Amino acid sequence: FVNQHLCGSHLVEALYLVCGERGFFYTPK
Amino acid sequence: GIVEQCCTSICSLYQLENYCN
Ligand SMILES: [Cl-]
Ligand SMILES: [Zn+2]
Numbered sequence: 926f927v928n929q930h931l932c933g934s935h936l937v938e939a940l941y942l943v944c945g946e947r948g949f950f951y952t953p954k
Numbered sequence: 955g956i957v958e959q960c961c962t963s964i965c966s967l968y969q970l971e972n973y974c975n
Contacts, residue, residue: 926968932961939960943967944974951973954955 931939940949956973959965 926966928964928966930961930964932957936956936960939967940970940973943970948975949973950975952955953957 937951940951943949956965956970959969
């Protein structure tokens, strides 16, 4: 795996892939 | 937060795991 810049909907897409069934929270500043 | 972490600078898929429930 590698690092990357993830913004807007792309960050949320990544969270979905990584967390899947666990669910996640998305809480911007 | 996550936005500072991953959008402004870069982040790993492992850091993202911190935000799983
Ligand atoms: Cl884009
Ligand atoms: Zn895009």
